[model samples]
Target: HHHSLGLMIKTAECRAEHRVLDIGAGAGHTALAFSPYVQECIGVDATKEMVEVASSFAQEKGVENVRFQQGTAESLPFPDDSFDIITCRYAAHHFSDVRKAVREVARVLKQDGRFLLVDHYAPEDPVLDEFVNHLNRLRDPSHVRESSLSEWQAMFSANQLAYQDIQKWNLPIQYDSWIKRGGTPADREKQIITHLNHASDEARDTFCITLNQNGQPISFCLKAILIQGIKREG
Candidate 1:
């Protein structure tokens, strides 16, 4: 419902006959979220383990229109023009080859299809940008660089996708829970905390880093972007 918060994505719902493919679907929830509107929903992830969990959850929910599959954004398993809608949530930042993955998403979506992507973003300033990227990498090595908002637009245009709508906001991140999710070691956690505490005034202002009673980063806002665009006409 992040997109439904009445911000960026248009309020129009997917057609009943449409098929939705949610790339990087963690536990199949997103795919199921689209099922009420679409005929079928497929949640795909690179990890087979997550796929198993996703399928089980779908059954537990008794959602007949949804299924889970093993797939990656770089190399989708579906045929060309396989889906009417494609969505990726917080996964683009982890892709080793974002451009290649963008091409694959474009290839699988039907002409005039919609693609909605949600991801954290970096500031336009190179200094702040580098700080944020390194900060993310420090917390999670799996993270690649977070593209600037303009970089996102360029990617869509390069892939022949028409810009439609976009909404952006800052998401506050809690330091404790955030680091725990990525399994950062105790010492690495301290390192990250120290680094953030010593961030340049500009970087701190850009990230909006918050400090607690102990002067540690209790939370910080992550620039979140919700982008919706359509496949270009052939």
Candidate 2:
């Protein structure tokens, strides 16, 4: 929800006719939000269930300018320069080929189009990065990896995308809610709790983990990033 707010703020800066291509448009939240401002919006997601839900939601909301399609991030089924703006939120970590997905995002974006990305990021420190990513994989099997800011910058540069601004924020996750969202099994949940309990003091401080009366973490932190980039033209 917070990420959506950031994207909306950025979208409002545009004053001309624009078309938006939303990748990983799970449930179509971002697409629906931006439909009124943009000339047209197309939201694509790999999960059929999510796409169906998003489509129904859009219809129910009486939003006519947005369309949802089922597709993957690594290979978008769209013509080159199809959209004036592109966005992906909270989904890049699940991509099997993050670089390929970035390349595809660049390919479909028009010259001078903005590419806005919002996703959880890993800490630059290798140990912390590994720990956070490991925990995510354990909690959600579909999670692939969360890249660091430097990694994302490299990928953007390699894809011939020019970086504009990168902003970081702390996202608080209630421990129970986080595990529950992932449908973590009972035993697995217990294991995760144990791991958290044994984490170093630095990790605990860095994440701002708070424990309940039962000594289980009641809340923790996740790092999130909002990246704005532009598609470079020859």
Candidate 3:
């Protein structure tokens, strides 16, 4: 669903001759999806396995215009002003140096180039923010951090990026699938379920957790944000 949102956003831009850079392009889904509309699409990821999977998937889909490479977001292997549009979706939490990644996005994007970011965000309140991020870390070890909305705005401002628009949305995930996706251990999965079950009323209500007939949580909500920005030139 997150990938679908990104594709919809990209389609809305509608440039037949534009170059797009997709950071953290897992499985090459978004890159392949947009290849037909854009002139060229490059997908980069830090993990070699993900790049291989994405490349194979693109090939299987017969998408020749899109390419996948193994690279980190903090240091993109591209020249300045290389692309007309840059997108990073649902992968910010794994970045060790998110600010550096944002800077690289600004550096590689053409002057006045559009940047679209999609990620799960923490609430402003320190208590809630800490609780939610902690829960995420326990569930997914690769999760480094989840930034607040204010932190995102500050990152854009400090980097001389102008925000054109922002939107917030809720994403619901089935607990079993979400846990399985991370390959969580049986014991650790139980710990996560226990945490959720004993969470405060505020937390439960905020996340909109739904339970199955057996009174076990089956799904929960995640707060997702999409921000569109443009690089500012001298």
Candidate 4:
């Protein structure tokens, strides 16, 4: 899902001899995929297990240009202007301090460097936003909050990342797969369904929540965002 919308980050225009950073890079697969395009690629994840897994996978694949390390978004270990390109996908919603992390992204990016971000978002409507956030949080404990699109634009503006392109998509989330991956137990999963089943009419219409024959939630649409911007140099 993340890969499909986020698309290929590495390109010839910004590829050769450039340094790339992939945040919350699970298994480091994407970093490895782009290894040949860049001089160096680094994948950082706060989870030690993920970091280890990524490293082992890279080693097993004989990938030389990419490396995985443990790090947090709000407090990156790199010095200023350390990367030419930074790609973050499907992970920003888990950030504890998203604003702080956004500034950190700006801080590490080189002058006029490219920064790409993709994440699940909430609607601008406060009611729907709160409703979606509630469901998301119940499904995954690690989820902090899903920011609205307007909030994201405001952050990019305040952080001095100039962007001219912003794309929105509705991610089709399967009821079982979403809860299973997040480790929601059977009872709690049922609770989620009940909540969705009884959700406000506005919420249902807004998210296109689908229900089964028994009135249990079978699927829903999750708002997603893809944004690419350049760090302001002048």
- Estimate the TM-score of every prediction: 0.92, 0.94, 0.92, 0.93
Q: Identify the superior model by TM-score, candidate 1 or candidate 2.
A: 2
* Runs with alpha carbons beyond 4 Å of true place in candidate 4: 2-13
Clash number for each model: 0, 0, 0, 0
Best by TM-score: 2
Q: List the residue pairs that clash in candidate 4.
A: none
Compared with the true structure, model 1 gives a TM-score of: 0.92
| RMSD in order of candidates | 2.1, 1.6, 2.0, 1.8
> Model 3: how far is 94 from its true place, Å?
0.7
Question: How far out, in Å, is residue 232 in model 4?
Answer: 1.0
Model-by-model lDDT, in order? 0.82, 0.85, 0.84, 0.83
Q: What lDDT, from 0 to 1, does candidate 4 have? A: 0.83
Candidate 4 residue lDDT tens string, 1-234? 545423645322456889989888988877887787789999899999999999999999898889988999999999999999888888899999999989999999998888888887888889999999989888888889988878878888898898754566788888877777888988878778888998898999888899988986788998876778688853
Deviation of model 4 at 187, angstroms = 2.8
**What lDDT does model 2 reach?**
0.85
Pairwise TM-score winner, candidates 2 and 4: 2
Residue-level lDDT of model 3, residues 52-134, one tens digit each, is 99988888888889998999999998999989888888888999999999999999998888888888889887877887898
Q: lDDT of model 2 at residue 86? A: 88
| Candidate 3: clashing pairs of residues | none
